[PDB]
Amino acid sequence: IAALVVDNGSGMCKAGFAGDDAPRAVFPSIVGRPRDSYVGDEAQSKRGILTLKYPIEHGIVTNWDDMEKIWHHTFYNELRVAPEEHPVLLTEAPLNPKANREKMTQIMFETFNTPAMYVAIQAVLSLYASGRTTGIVMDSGDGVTHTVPIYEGYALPHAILRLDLAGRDLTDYLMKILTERGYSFTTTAEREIVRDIKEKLCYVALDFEQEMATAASSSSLEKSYELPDGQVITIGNERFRCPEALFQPSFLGMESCGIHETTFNSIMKCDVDIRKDLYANTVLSGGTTMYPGIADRMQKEITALAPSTMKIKIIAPPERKYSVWIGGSILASLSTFQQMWISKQEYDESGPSIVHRKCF
Amino acid sequence: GDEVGALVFDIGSYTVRAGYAGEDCPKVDFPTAIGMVVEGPTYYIDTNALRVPRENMEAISPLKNGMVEDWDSFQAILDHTYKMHVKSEASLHPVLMSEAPWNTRAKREKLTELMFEHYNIPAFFLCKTAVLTAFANGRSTGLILDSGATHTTAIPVHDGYVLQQGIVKSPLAGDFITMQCRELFQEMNIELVPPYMIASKEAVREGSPANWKRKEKLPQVTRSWHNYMCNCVIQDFQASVLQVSDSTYDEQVAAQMPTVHYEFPNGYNCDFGAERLKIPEGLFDPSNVKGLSGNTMLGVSHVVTTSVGMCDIDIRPGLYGSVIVAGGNTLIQSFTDRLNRELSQKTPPSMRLKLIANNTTVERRFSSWIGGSILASLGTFQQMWISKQEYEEGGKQCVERKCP
Amino acid sequence: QVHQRIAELRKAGLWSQRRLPKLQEAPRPKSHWDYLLEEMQWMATDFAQERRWKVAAAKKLVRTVVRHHEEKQLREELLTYTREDAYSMEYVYEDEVMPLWTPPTPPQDDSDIYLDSVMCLMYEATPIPEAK
Amino acid sequence: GLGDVRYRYCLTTLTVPQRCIGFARRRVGRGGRVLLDRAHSDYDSVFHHLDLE
Amino acid sequence: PLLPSDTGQGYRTVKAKLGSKKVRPWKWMPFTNPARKDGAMFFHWRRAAEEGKDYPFARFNKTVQVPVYSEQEYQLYLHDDAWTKAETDHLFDLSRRFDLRFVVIHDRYDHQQFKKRSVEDLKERYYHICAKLANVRAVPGFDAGHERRRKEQLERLYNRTPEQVAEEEYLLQELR
Ligand SMILES: Nc1ncnc2c1ncn2[C@@H]1O[C@H](COP(=O)(O)OP(=O)(O)OP(=O)(O)O)[C@@H](O)[C@H]1O
Ligand SMILES: Nc1ncnc2c1ncn2[C@@H]1O[C@H](COP(=O)(O)OP(=O)(O)OP(=O)(O)O)[C@@H](O)[C@H]1O
């Protein structure tokens, strides 16, 4: 009966019905082509036989036919509902070009015949999911990281900042260091193994030098992990060396500022008055923020940077990775939002620019 | 026909503003100052690259008095803008650019040549900032009062054309306020420590000496970069504390006003009283400013009156009837009220003085970019683009003819 | 007082400063630049109105969301109008029709004259001057 | 004043949300959309006449 | 003060109706503008069924008609004892460019390569030239001094000091 909510990301795609508390289907966004097409997990196992491509890069779609196949797969196979029967809500990364919005609207209306649709910004959806009026959202997914300040739900485009450090880089760095300790990971299978290790084991250190000294002397920070072959490996100081790259990009070799510095700069860039609220309503989102202990380190860093009289308060819900989708799910179920839909007749009469007329 | 995929650029001494035509607010806004290292040189441009300290790095800007001087730096800035923020080939997008009212002909010609030959754009057009500011508010005729970082100027506009004769310039602008702030701090003996030097800070009682530690791992940096960081701190102080007195500055009345609280990066915090009012009074009465006894300087209100008085009489009712305020420096608290009081007092009663109400940051700073977007959106404007085929012959000949 | 105000009217000198003469004229039809200026005015108005609506709608949606969350907790125990009104019925006054601000239209014939901001000299001619 | 009509505001009533909505002005949007521009008054509370006998 | 924009929503009672109709495809297409002499092609969002139709804005390209003359005409009729041919040609070129907006023309007029002129002088010269040319062209079958006086009076009124304004106001009120 209700509408659909589809969220597209560089690493994972999430789809579900409005009003539900969690996405019904989650799968990786990859398209396999022969050396018919394959998508998601079916392509992953076939990837040994097939050639793989990614239709999204740094949150920006770069190939459209692949994206069309991704949407077709999502709807018909994962959701098993004909699109023309339901309204469809979509998500968009901040600072997205106009042409992308127009092409997306054209595809959605003409190819799939959806009766209505809307496009929303992921950061504001995360803010909705948190349930706050004014705040600053820190978003770090698989491909890209953004910091977006919001004032009464209106995202200030000029204060937004961007950073090209995300989970993919951290996984590659973990592979590099684990090879450097003496193991051997080359192909995509070992890359998935390393991603699993990163998700399972790594954590953020509150004080890097003290933890380094402890790992230098003590055995109390070591761990072991079991591989698919049944053989085991040992992992040590690497556990917190990898996530530390967030606050010290120099490790990866990039001359860029850390996430805390970027957030502080974004807050400072806005007007003087609203700074007080942003400090007290800082929000974290995305999969990359799921590392244990990140919130305390962030709070300590921003407390060091920020003026003494301000009050800093980090917010990190346990399910923050799906928070972006949860926000969209809440929004679609609202009553007042029903008047904000773009109808099919409006697209027919006006054209794709109608999206630039409504979806905000 | 109102939706041609065009881009519009706006560049100033403080920040560079770019975006897509038809949008309401500029998409990207980053500072104009960039870092340069010799041994062609290497440029670090955006905010993230600029903050990181490094050895032998100097701070430079391509603009001088509102005109381009360092063409290599300008080309690097445009390259960074395109590649990182736009992420689209320049050959596909028509471009619109703003220019200072007094920009000379040869520099316009060289800019057009650079764009067409190097960036290979499909179409081009140039306009002056005053006209675009007038368009943003929807006025064909009006007086534009602009107070940026470098100059405070008054430009009259009639039927969408700039009247060259009436332009009046003054040097009292944001940089003058920054110099005044530096003088104040030197008088108070407050040491300025830029954030990059601080490793950590402790809380200290009001007025007491600061307590902080230095980052030992810092490689030595140059003079200009350190000075630029100090200027950033002082700019923040300007934005936070200063205020303009409603009437003429009076020490006794100011002394009775409540104070304000500020905290520096190194943890030092002290309360400011009459000093936060005495400084901005310079913009309205430069004569009494210490160290600048030269009375030949003109205040903002006197600048406006002189600029209007130099135009044709029949147009003066039109100019006084629509006065537009623009520029970042006008954002100082209580500036518009003092300007309105002065103008209403000094203007002859026979003329109906009016000030356009636009007192918000986004539209007060980005007015020129908004006007450019509006102009690019117009359907009938599509006739006026300069094309590559037109660039071949009339690129030099018709550029003089095309954009008056 | 009458001799002194006849002195004063010979003072300020109707021959000196008080009341003024007529303006001349020459007709001329509109041109491309005038149409561009009108379209610019219309577009600027549209831009401003859109942005302002934009802010208001965002605020309203945020307030609705926060109140929805509050209602969820407690359970533990104006911006649009219909299509028909937009494109039908003319809001006639009775005892005429309300205007509508449309973008400029191309001239069907050479009849639209260019006007300007003379303002001070009130428009439309003077029928009966003195026998010059 | 200039006294132009296209810049005038006047009282109006909608049909679906049937009520007097204060001073309003009609205008044409970007693509084809027809919009109503609403002004402000300090008597907005009392303007709910309807049916004007 | 807000503004309501038209919408076809607020409910989903329209499950029908919308489910029986299909949209007309759109296209991103190039177009030719007759107003452009170079023939350059720009791209366009438009309904795919109306390809090739001329640009509907080209009907706004209307120019102001300004006369022209040859050497022989300037030899016979337009010769003047206070204007060189080059100066008049400059005046007429400026008039064509700026569409007889004489204030703008006076602003942009080259006052150093040619002796300074007031706007009234420009108007007078232009009207004399055009009138004589039209008169000759007709098959068998302006007042500068007044404007100058008006502008001088306006200038005198403008520089009136406030005490004079108050004195005039007092005298006026005495007459009721
Ligand atoms: N603790 C963790 N739990 C889950 N995923 C984690 C964790 N730490 C890092 N990750 C990485 O986070 C990524 C998942 O992030 P997410 O699902 O938010 O991405 P996305 O939606 O594709 O991003 P984007 O929209 O920014 O392109 C995966 O690469 C996963 O390896
Ligand atoms: N919020 C603020 N309050 C007070 N002053 C401000 C504020 N924001 C900016 N300024 C002042 O305005 C200056 C920037 O002005 P603006 O944005 O108009 O520059 P610009 O147009 O790039 O300059 P220019 O035309 O001289 O090249 C800042 O350097 C500072 O001096």
Author numbering:
A (entry chain J): 5 to 39, 51 to 375
B (entry chain L): 8 to 46, 65 to 429
C (entry chain G): 780 to 856, 2220 to 2237, 2243 to 2279
D (entry chain H): 432 to 484
E (entry chain I): 70 to 210, 218 to 252
From the paper:
The human Tat-interactive protein, 60 kDa (TIP60) complex, a fusion of the yeast nucleosome acetyltransferase of histone H4 (NuA4) and switch/sucrose nonfermentable related 1 (SWR1) complexes, is involved in both histone acetylation and H2A.Z-H2B histone exchange and is essential for cell viability, playing a role, among other cellular processes, in gene regulation and DNA double-strand break repair. TIP60 can modify nucleosomes through covalent and noncovalent mechanisms by using its histone acetyltransferase (HAT) module and its E1A binding protein P400 (EP400) chromatin remodeler subunit, respectively. TIP60 consists of five modules, including TINTIN, HAT, TRRAP, ARP, and BASE, each with distinct functions. Within the complex, the EP400 protein functions as a major scaffold, making interactions with all the functional and structural modules, a role similar to that of the Eaf1 subunit in the yeast NuA4 complex and of the Swr1 subunit in the SWR1 complex, the two subunits of which EP400 is a merge.
Following the unresolved N-terminal domain of EP400 and preceding its motor domain, the pre-HSA region and a portion of HSA interact with DMAP1, ACTB, and one BAF53a subunit, collectively forming the ARP module. In the TIP60 complex, the ARP module plays a central role connecting to all other structural and functional modules, in contrast to its peripheral location in the yeast NuA4 and SWR1 complexes. Within the ARP module, the HSA of EP400 functions as a “pillar” that is surrounded by BAF53a, ACTB, DMAP1, and EPC1 (right), leaving the other half of HSA exposed to the solvent. The PMD of EP400 folds back toward the N terminus, integrating itself into the ARP module and contributing to the surface that tethers the HAT module to the rest of the complex. Of the 48 amino acids of EPC1 visible in our structure (amino acid 432 to 479), a short segment (amino acid 457 to 464) interacts with a negatively charged cavity created by EP400 and DMAP1 through four positively charged residues that form salt bridges and hydrogen bonds with the cavity. The pre-HSA helix of EP400 plays an important role within the core of the ARP module, where it is sandwiched between DMAP1 and the PMD of EP400 (right). Specifically, R807 and H811 in the pre-HSA interact with D168 and K131 in DMAP1, respectively, whereas R807 and K809 of the pre-HSA interact with Y2261 and with D2259 and I2260 of the PMD, respectively. Notably, the R807 residue of the pre-HSA, which participates in interactions with both DMAP1 and the PMD, has been identified as a cancer-associated mutation (R807H). Additionally, D162 and R170 in the SANT domain of DMAP1 form salt bridges and hydrogen-bond interactions with R426 and D184 of BAF53a, respectively.
